[PDB]
Design a protein around this motif. Structure first.
Motif: not given
Length: 100
Positions: A75-100
């Motif tokens: 449900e999250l948003q990969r284009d969330w304005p709350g993710y900084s230059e780092i967060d964005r790259r720090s989130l892409e992981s989880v989703l990848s680890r969870k979202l088969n």
């Protein structure tokens, strides 16, 4: 083809703003807020938060920390304005680890 618009966080639904935070890591009822409140947290929502945390996250009596569910990650948003230059790259992981 539009030109531009005013994309503010407030305009976004509380839930999203919440999950978007719990995503990277688990947050505490009070803590999680300290992050949102900054930008501005509605009083009427301040109470709902507790309910949302359980609707999208899971409280662990262990460290009284809320953990962002798995499915919610979708449900999250990969284009969330709350993710900084780092967060964005720090989130892409989880989703990848969870979202088969």
């Amino acid at each position: 083809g539009s030109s531009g618009s005013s994309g503010t966080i407030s305009q976004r639904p509380y839930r999203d703003r919440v999950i978007h935070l719990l995503a990277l890591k688990a947050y505490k009822k009070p803590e999680l807020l300290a992050r949102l409140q900054k930008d501005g947290v509605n009083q009427k929502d301040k109470n709902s938060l507790g309910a949302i945390l359980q609707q999208v996250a899971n409280l662990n009596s262990k460290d009284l920390s809320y953990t962002l569910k798995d499915y919610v990650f979708k449900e999250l948003q990969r284009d969330w304005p709350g993710y900084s230059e780092i967060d964005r790259r720090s989130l892409e992981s989880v989703l990848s680890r969870k979202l088969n």
